[model samples]
Target: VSEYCSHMIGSGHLQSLQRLIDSQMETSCQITFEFVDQEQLKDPVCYLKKAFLLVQDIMEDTMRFRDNTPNAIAIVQLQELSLRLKSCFTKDKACVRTFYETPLQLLEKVKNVFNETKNLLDKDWNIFSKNCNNSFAECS
Candidate 1:
């Protein structure tokens, strides 16, 4: 029917991406600032799994509907937000360095995954969809 109603990605697409980072941010911060358990390696594993699931959901949504401009922008926004979230983990010198490096490192992994997906869904949605064209056209 309407634009926002019709042209949206599937449920949990954005939240899944965000939560993965949130979980990792908390875990990493805790490890950087405090003592980590031996089982703490699961934290990154959890983050990557959720991030991959979220990326695939977005990919499939775009593939099925063929108009995912909003989803694409949302995905990028979430990725950027994840990086910003990482920057908030600074503590003392030792902990601060670890905190800073850990999130940024995880962010690079996220970016790599996103870039791989981008390479696959290399469609020019603005040209392909009148909705995207009109939205961009209205902007400027």
Candidate 2:
């Protein structure tokens, strides 16, 4: 139960989110939604699908612009969708770790490689875990 492990969101969450985005919003390419047993948000895929459907419904139903330029519809839909997506994170301790610390560390890692290669990801997970005895200290 190190801070590193606690904060880790796992690749699964990122992969699941990517899949949802591809299938729903990018559906012209026509990929089916693949189910994950657990999700970062409660029923995360369901939420994504609903949001996608609502935006499509709004654009088609309200706008008579079969031929005209669309403006207000796009802006309003973006605002609504972004607000809902922002609230989707669970924000519990682990979730906080994932949302905040993990990404911070990842940025640090990219820096570690580009600017500093005795880099983080270059090391085996076993070696990396042992090094977390002083997690916040400089990596040798």
Q: How accurate is candidate 1 locally (lDDT)?
A: 0.35
The top-ranked prediction according to lDDT is 1
What would the per-residue lDDT of candidate 1 be over residues 57-77, giving only the tens digit for each residue? 333442121246554555555
- The residue ranges of model 2 lying beyond 4 angstroms of the native Cα positions read 1-41, 63-66, 70-140
Report the C-alpha lDDT of model 2 over 1-140, residue by residue, as the tens digit. 22332323234333433332333322223212222112332433233323333333333443222343233443344345434433322221111111222322322322222221112223322222222222212212
Candidate 1: Cα lDDT at 3: 30
lDDT of 2 at 14: 37
Residue ranges of candidate 1 with Cα displaced over 4 Å: 1-51, 54-76, 79-101, 123-140
Best by TM-score: 1
* Candidates' C-alpha lDDT: 0.35, 0.29
